[PDB]
Design a protein around this ligand. Sequence first.
Ligand SMILES: CC(C)CCC[C@@H](C)[C@H]1CC[C@H]2[C@@H]3CC=C4C[C@@H](O)CC[C@]4(C)[C@H]3CC[C@]12C
Ligand SMILES: CC(C)CCC[C@@H](C)[C@H]1CC[C@H]2[C@@H]3CC=C4C[C@@H](O)CC[C@]4(C)[C@H]3CC[C@]12C
Ligand SMILES: CC(C)CCC[C@@H](C)[C@H]1CC[C@H]2[C@@H]3CC=C4C[C@@H](O)CC[C@]4(C)[C@H]3CC[C@]12C
Ligand SMILES: CC(C)CCC[C@@H](C)[C@H]1CC[C@H]2[C@@H]3CC=C4C[C@@H](O)CC[C@]4(C)[C@H]3CC[C@]12C
Ligand SMILES: CC(C)CCC[C@@H](C)[C@H]1CC[C@H]2[C@@H]3CC=C4C[C@@H](O)CC[C@]4(C)[C@H]3CC[C@]12C
Ligand SMILES: CC(C)CCC[C@@H](C)[C@H]1CC[C@H]2[C@@H]3CC=C4C[C@@H](O)CC[C@]4(C)[C@H]3CC[C@]12C
Lengths: 102, 102, 102, 102, 102, 102
Amino acid sequence: NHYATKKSVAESMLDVALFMSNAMRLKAVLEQGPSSHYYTTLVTLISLSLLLQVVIGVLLVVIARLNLNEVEKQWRLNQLNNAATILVFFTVVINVFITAFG
Amino acid sequence: NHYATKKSVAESMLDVALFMSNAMRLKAVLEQGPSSHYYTTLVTLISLSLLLQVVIGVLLVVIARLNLNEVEKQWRLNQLNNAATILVFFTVVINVFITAFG
Amino acid sequence: NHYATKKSVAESMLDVALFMSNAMRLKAVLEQGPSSHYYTTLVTLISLSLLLQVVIGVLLVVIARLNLNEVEKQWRLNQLNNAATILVFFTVVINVFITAFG
Amino acid sequence: NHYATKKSVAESMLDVALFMSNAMRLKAVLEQGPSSHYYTTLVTLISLSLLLQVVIGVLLVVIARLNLNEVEKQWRLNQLNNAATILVFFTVVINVFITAFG
Amino acid sequence: NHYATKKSVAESMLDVALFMSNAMRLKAVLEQGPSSHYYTTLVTLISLSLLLQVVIGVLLVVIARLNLNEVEKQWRLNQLNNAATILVFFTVVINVFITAFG
Amino acid sequence: NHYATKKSVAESMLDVALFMSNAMRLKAVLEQGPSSHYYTTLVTLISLSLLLQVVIGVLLVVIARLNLNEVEKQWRLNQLNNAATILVFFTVVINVFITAFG
Ligand SMILES: CC(C)CCC[C@@H](C)[C@H]1CC[C@H]2[C@@H]3CC=C4C[C@@H](O)CC[C@]4(C)[C@H]3CC[C@]12C
Ligand SMILES: CC(C)CCC[C@@H](C)[C@H]1CC[C@H]2[C@@H]3CC=C4C[C@@H](O)CC[C@]4(C)[C@H]3CC[C@]12C
Ligand SMILES: CC(C)CCC[C@@H](C)[C@H]1CC[C@H]2[C@@H]3CC=C4C[C@@H](O)CC[C@]4(C)[C@H]3CC[C@]12C
Ligand SMILES: CC(C)CCC[C@@H](C)[C@H]1CC[C@H]2[C@@H]3CC=C4C[C@@H](O)CC[C@]4(C)[C@H]3CC[C@]12C
Ligand SMILES: CC(C)CCC[C@@H](C)[C@H]1CC[C@H]2[C@@H]3CC=C4C[C@@H](O)CC[C@]4(C)[C@H]3CC[C@]12C
Ligand SMILES: CC(C)CCC[C@@H](C)[C@H]1CC[C@H]2[C@@H]3CC=C4C[C@@H](O)CC[C@]4(C)[C@H]3CC[C@]12C
């Protein structure tokens, strides 16, 4: 099998617990109606939270592939590691606001 | 037999367990009627979910053939491996939205 | 899992208990109405308090990465260390004003 | 005079002709009232064009100071030069949308 | 001036007459109402028409910068030129349908 | 300019008159209703004609780029030229067939 090997890697670098938790939260607020409180802020907070997770997932794929294969450049890795670390940090910050406003 | 030899390879690089579930779920949503909730979003989510699997399957066929037969080209494998791994990632992401909205 | 590793670092350098407390305080005054006493000063004090934590978190990310990898430069580290310590100092002052005015 | 020397350089890397036009455009839409058509989209489009203009100006300050002063590093300049050009590109793109929706 | 040097270069890789035209058509159909004939297909055709040009513009910035500065890497340029030339081709095809459906 | 050169190159290798005529014929047939005689055959014929035209354009872009840049390979060029010629043969036959049923 070859697809199963890819699925494990692609599922290794994504928080399925947090990603799936936000999935129903977007659904629950959507069925609650635009007139409901914090509808406008919760939609954008969740949307960019999931959006940041996708970009995080893509970045983690690049770093993992580039780590062992490439050994010459290290300055590119340092920038990518910082961007991956910082982007994860903003997901932690957003999740608190979702929890606080939820 | 020579066809069974090809059929094993053509089945090894496909998640037939996952592909069949999306196939049956697509059947259910169509028979539930357009008036059913999330009809417009579920069809496109499943459609490109199935589409991404076929594209991944085609990519896996090329990578497997090019692995052992050719060794000089190395960036082409790295681009294809990164494209295959990332394409698998969005199937994982889309599957999450399928379960959440289903 | 790699996102767990990134979540470990991104959460170690954040005052989660205080960040959550300020976020909930901000929601309470917001629902309390602009006519509430000390509305204007409470919002700006909390707002820049949360802003300071985000800036501190990013600075702590840079310092944590640059410590072990970089050894040629130390004057840059000294400036970055002082900015983080002083920025943390102004945070402590704010919650004193927040607690006093709340 | 020294503030004259700084003032000229500060204006050498800013398009005051374009900057001032948006400022009056933001004033016009702000006084026109939220009830005006395309109020929400105009405010965000104009504001982030102004914000992008400031960020470009700060980037140009760094490049000018670093260009003649520094000769060893070259990768940093190319990354800064590119981000300067692409950031200008979005201002051109955004300005077209303000003109179209004006 | 230094902003004009970037702005003139960033404008040399855009067809502003072509970009501005599509922006007006998008405004025209939008004010015309969702009930209008071919409202749905016109919105999505124009939306990806504009979106494609931004992607080409970003690629054109990279291509121009990389051409003179770097000379060792050659296969990267051919992929970038192929992506730019093909993406321009799809813009021509899309513009045909918008004219046809308008 | 740079987008102008790309648009000229991409427009050289597309028969815009035939594409535009096919698009108008498809639009007219679609407006004429499903009850129209030869509806489904006309729809599928025009759709596959447009698809063949797009594929021909992509192949021509690839051949035009690969001609001067690469000289070591000739058999691939011969295969691509044969495929392009055969595809234009089929699309010409298709337009003849639509003209017959028009
Ligand atoms: C609104 C936000 C969430 C979206 C856009 C923010 C992103 C693109 C920006 C905001 C702050 C930025 C970081 C700020 C500081 C550093 C440290 C430096 O040594 C390398 C670049 C790096 C790592 C930047 C990478 C890009 C970054 C993460
Ligand atoms: C909406 C989506 C599913 C359609 C478009 C997806 C495809 C065409 C795009 C989206 C993101 C892209 C990837 C983004 C980043 C990289 C890393 C780079 O080193 C090689 C190319 C590679 C691997 C790209 C390959 C093509 C890619 C997978
Ligand atoms: C009023 C506050 C909240 C906003 C501005 C704060 C920041 C930008 C300023 C205010 C005081 C400043 C510090 C004042 C004194 C020192 C010691 C000196 O040897 C190095 C710079 C350093 C470490 C400064 C760093 C930047 C600093 C922290
Ligand atoms: C929505 C917009 C306005 C905000 C985000 C834009 C910024 C943060 C991003 C988006 C596209 C990015 C650029 C995309 C491509 C390149 C070329 C590469 O060789 C160096 C990085 C560079 C130059 C990136 C710099 C940062 C960049 C400009
Ligand atoms: C529906 C469309 C607009 C979205 C996806 C289109 C883009 C991402 C895809 C579709 C066809 C692709 C091209 C197909 C063939 C080639 C030739 C090869 O030697 C290099 C890659 C290149 C140049 C591909 C680049 C990416 C490409 C242009
Ligand atoms: C429904 C139809 C139009 C789609 C299938 C057509 C394509 C995929 C097929 C049909 C006929 C085929 C061609 C038939 C004969 C030749 C000559 C041979 O020396 C090289 C391959 C080449 C050039 C084939 C290329 C692919 C081809 C053009």
